[PDB]
Design a protein around this motif. Sequence first.
Motif, PDB file in Angstrom:
ATOM      1  N   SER A  98      64.904  38.283  48.751  1.00  0.00           N
ATOM      2  CA  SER A  98      64.275  39.290  49.580  1.00  0.00           C
ATOM      3  C   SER A  98      62.790  39.419  49.285  1.00  0.00           C
ATOM      4  O   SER A  98      62.374  39.431  48.116  1.00  0.00           O
ATOM      5  N   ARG A  99      61.993  39.546  50.338  1.00  0.00           N
ATOM      6  CA  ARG A  99      60.559  39.805  50.203  1.00  0.00           C
ATOM      7  C   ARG A  99      60.254  41.219  49.691  1.00  0.00           C
ATOM      8  O   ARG A  99      59.390  41.380  48.826  1.00  0.00           O
ATOM      9  N   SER A 100      60.939  42.245  50.190  1.00  0.00           N
ATOM     10  CA  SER A 100      60.594  43.629  49.800  1.00  0.00           C
ATOM     11  C   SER A 100      61.229  44.090  48.486  1.00  0.00           C
ATOM     12  O   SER A 100      60.680  44.948  47.780  1.00  0.00           O
ATOM     13  N   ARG A 101      62.405  43.555  48.190  1.00  0.00           N
ATOM     14  CA  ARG A 101      63.144  43.920  46.994  1.00  0.00           C
ATOM     15  C   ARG A 101      63.362  42.625  46.229  1.00  0.00           C
ATOM     16  O   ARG A 101      64.396  41.986  46.373  1.00  0.00           O
ATOM     17  N   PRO A 102      62.362  42.216  45.427  1.00  0.00           N
ATOM     18  CA  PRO A 102      62.353  40.872  44.852  1.00  0.00           C
ATOM     19  C   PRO A 102      63.532  40.540  43.939  1.00  0.00           C
ATOM     20  O   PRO A 102      63.823  39.363  43.731  1.00  0.00           O
ATOM     21  N   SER A 103      64.202  41.565  43.411  1.00  0.00           N
ATOM     22  CA  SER A 103      65.402  41.370  42.606  1.00  0.00           C
ATOM     23  C   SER A 103      66.663  41.276  43.478  1.00  0.00           C
ATOM     24  O   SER A 103      67.763  41.113  42.951  1.00  0.00           O
ATOM     25  N   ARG A 104      66.497  41.371  44.804  1.00  0.00           N
ATOM     26  CA  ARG A 104      67.617  41.326  45.755  1.00  0.00           C
ATOM     27  C   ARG A 104      67.556  40.068  46.618  1.00  0.00           C
ATOM     28  O   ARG A 104      66.554  39.337  46.634  1.00  0.00           O
ATOM     29  N   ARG A 105      68.651  39.828  47.330  1.00  0.00           N
ATOM     30  CA  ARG A 105      68.819  38.653  48.155  1.00  0.00           C
ATOM     31  C   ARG A 105      69.394  39.042  49.508  1.00  0.00           C
ATOM     32  O   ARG A 105      69.931  40.138  49.673  1.00  0.00           O
ATOM     33  N   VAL A 106      69.241  38.139  50.473  1.00  0.00           N
ATOM     34  CA  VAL A 106      69.733  38.356  51.832  1.00  0.00           C
ATOM     35  C   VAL A 106      70.555  37.143  52.240  1.00  0.00           C
ATOM     36  O   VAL A 106      70.120  36.003  52.079  1.00  0.00           O
ATOM     37  N   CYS A 107      71.729  37.394  52.812  1.00  0.00           N
ATOM     38  CA  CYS A 107      72.515  36.331  53.419  1.00  0.00           C
ATOM     39  C   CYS A 107      72.067  36.187  54.862  1.00  0.00           C
ATOM     40  O   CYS A 107      72.102  37.170  55.597  1.00  0.00           O
ATOM     41  N   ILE A 108      71.678  34.978  55.279  1.00  0.00           N
ATOM     42  CA  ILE A 108      71.234  34.792  56.654  1.00  0.00           C
ATOM     43  C   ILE A 108      72.293  34.207  57.587  1.00  0.00           C
ATOM     44  O   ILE A 108      72.004  33.898  58.741  1.00  0.00           O
ATOM     45  N   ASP A 109      73.520  34.073  57.104  1.00  0.00           N
ATOM     46  CA  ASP A 109      74.595  33.538  57.931  1.00  0.00           C
ATOM     47  C   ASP A 109      74.839  34.404  59.156  1.00  0.00           C
ATOM     48  O   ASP A 109      74.695  35.622  59.116  1.00  0.00           O
ATOM     49  N   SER A 110      75.280  33.746  60.222  1.00  0.00           N
ATOM     50  CA  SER A 110      75.850  34.393  61.389  1.00  0.00           C
ATOM     51  C   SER A 110      77.362  34.117  61.301  1.00  0.00           C
ATOM     52  O   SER A 110      77.781  33.083  60.750  1.00  0.00           O
ATOM     53  N   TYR A 111      78.189  35.052  61.739  1.00  0.00           N
ATOM     54  CA  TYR A 111      79.631  34.850  61.638  1.00  0.00           C
ATOM     55  C   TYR A 111      80.345  35.493  62.823  1.00  0.00           C
ATOM     56  O   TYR A 111      80.099  36.651  63.167  1.00  0.00           O
ATOM     57  N   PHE A 112      81.260  34.735  63.413  1.00  0.00           N
ATOM     58  CA  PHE A 112      82.070  35.168  64.552  1.00  0.00           C
ATOM     59  C   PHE A 112      83.349  35.824  64.013  1.00  0.00           C
ATOM     60  O   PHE A 112      84.208  35.159  63.432  1.00  0.00           O
ATOM     61  N   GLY A 113      83.468  37.129  64.188  1.00  0.00           N
ATOM     62  CA  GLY A 113      84.600  37.909  63.668  1.00  0.00           C
ATOM     63  C   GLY A 113      84.317  39.396  63.810  1.00  0.00           C
ATOM     64  O   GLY A 113      83.224  39.777  64.148  1.00  0.00           O
ATOM     65  N   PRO A 114      85.327  40.268  63.569  1.00  0.00           N
ATOM     66  CA  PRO A 114      85.151  41.722  63.729  1.00  0.00           C
ATOM     67  C   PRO A 114      84.031  42.270  62.875  1.00  0.00           C
ATOM     68  O   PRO A 114      83.742  41.731  61.790  1.00  0.00           O
ATOM     69  N   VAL A 115      83.393  43.324  63.359  1.00  0.00           N
ATOM     70  CA  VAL A 115      82.369  43.997  62.585  1.00  0.00           C
ATOM     71  C   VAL A 115      82.901  44.204  61.152  1.00  0.00           C
ATOM     72  O   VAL A 115      84.011  44.710  60.957  1.00  0.00           O
ATOM     73  N   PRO A 116      82.131  43.779  60.133  1.00  0.00           N
ATOM     74  CA  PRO A 116      82.606  43.960  58.763  1.00  0.00           C
ATOM     75  C   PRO A 116      82.690  45.439  58.358  1.00  0.00           C
ATOM     76  O   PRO A 116      82.050  46.286  58.964  1.00  0.00           O
ATOM     77  N   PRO A 117      83.458  45.747  57.300  1.00  0.00           N
ATOM     78  CA  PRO A 117      83.485  47.141  56.837  1.00  0.00           C
ATOM     79  C   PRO A 117      82.105  47.555  56.337  1.00  0.00           C
ATOM     80  O   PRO A 117      81.350  46.710  55.837  1.00  0.00           O
ATOM     81  N   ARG A 118      81.792  48.842  56.440  1.00  0.00           N
ATOM     82  CA  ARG A 118      80.581  49.383  55.820  1.00  0.00           C
ATOM     83  C   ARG A 118      80.740  49.336  54.299  1.00  0.00           C
ATOM     84  O   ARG A 118      81.852  49.468  53.776  1.00  0.00           O
ATOM     85  N   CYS A 119      79.636  49.140  53.587  1.00  0.00           N
ATOM     86  CA  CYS A 119      79.668  49.257  52.126  1.00  0.00           C
ATOM     87  C   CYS A 119      79.692  50.706  51.653  1.00  0.00           C
ATOM     88  O   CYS A 119      80.373  51.042  50.674  1.00  0.00           O
ATOM     89  N   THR A 120      78.923  51.551  52.335  1.00  0.00           N
ATOM     90  CA  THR A 120      78.784  52.960  51.983  1.00  0.00           C
ATOM     91  C   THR A 120      79.561  53.792  52.991  1.00  0.00           C
ATOM     92  O   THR A 120      79.312  53.727  54.189  1.00  0.00           O
TER      93      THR A 120
END
Length: 120
Positions: A98-120
């Motif tokens: 991640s650019r804004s949170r340098p200790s974090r990462r982003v998955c850039i995958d696209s995926y065909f399937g139901p909306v995933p569960p919320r984390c929070t």
Amino acid sequence: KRPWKCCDEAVCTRSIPPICTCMDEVFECPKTCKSCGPSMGDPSRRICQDQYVGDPGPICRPWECCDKAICTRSNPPTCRCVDEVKKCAPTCKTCLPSRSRPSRRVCIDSYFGPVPPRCT
């Protein structure tokens, strides 16, 4: 053996071992599945119908949950997730820092399937 290799929507009992159904929608009946058929009272929403006894295995989707999903309007949709996470899921194909949170990462995958569960 197990009727699926992975399952995004495993409904399992809290037992040793779990008793499980995979509610994932399928578009052709997987070779590992004994029989496919309708689900949720929808003749067109087909699943593997098999009940399995044992650990259901991993999810298929590239994120266990997402607080910032961006999806198309189809059912099921195609979604991406813009959460900035400490570690991408093992099922993420392309993970970048991640650019804004340098200790974090982003998955850039696209995926065909139901909306995933919320984390929070």
